[PDB]
Design a binder for this molecule. Structure first.
Ligand code: NA
Ligand code: NA
Length: 157
């Protein structure tokens, strides 16, 4: 059922959250987890994606699922983004890109005559036993949160 195998150490990585606490993926054992990676706090597309998930939070709750957004911005940046937008789910400050590399979302592009790395907008659904059962890569924001919710409902049944 897994579409991606993560290094075992990934599940014990301490993930710094908005609000000043930490979590780990293993700490989410027992419920579904949506992990959405986005390139940058407080941009038009990334704000749209976060607000879309936030608007659907009660529907994710009805499945007992939790959501985590992830970028490499600082905790302070995440706190400001969460406060301004009213997000009711946490953002991971993956400043060292450890979680991003585990999910293989750091992608290289030949541009400006160089090799340029960056976060590719991507989302994953993690089962209550920690298996990555669905992945979306190179995500277009429009319709995405709705599609993730629909897939979660399909898997959780
Ligand atoms: Na950290
Ligand atoms: Na989980």
């Amino acid at each position: 059922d897994a579409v991606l195998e993560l290094p075992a150490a990934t599940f014990d990585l301490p993930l710094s959250l908005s609000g000043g606490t930490q979590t780990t993926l293993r700490a989410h054992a027992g419920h579904w987890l949506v992990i959405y990676f986005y390139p940058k706090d407080s941009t038009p597309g990334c704000t749209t994606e976060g607000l879309d998930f936030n608007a659907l939070l009660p529907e994710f709750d009805k499945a007992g699922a939790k959501i985590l957004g992830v970028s490499r911005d600082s905790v302070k940046s995440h706190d400001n983004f969460c406060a301004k937008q009213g997000f009711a789910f946490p953002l991971v400050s993956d400043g060292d890109e450890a979680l991003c590399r585990a999910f293989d979302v750091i992608k290289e592009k030949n541009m400006y005559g160089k090799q340029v790395l960056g976060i590719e907008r991507s989302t994953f659904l993690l089962s209550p036993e920690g298996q990555v059962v669905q992945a979306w890569r190179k995500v277009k924001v429009a319709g995405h949160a709705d599609a993730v919710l629909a897939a979660l409902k399909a898997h959780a049944k």
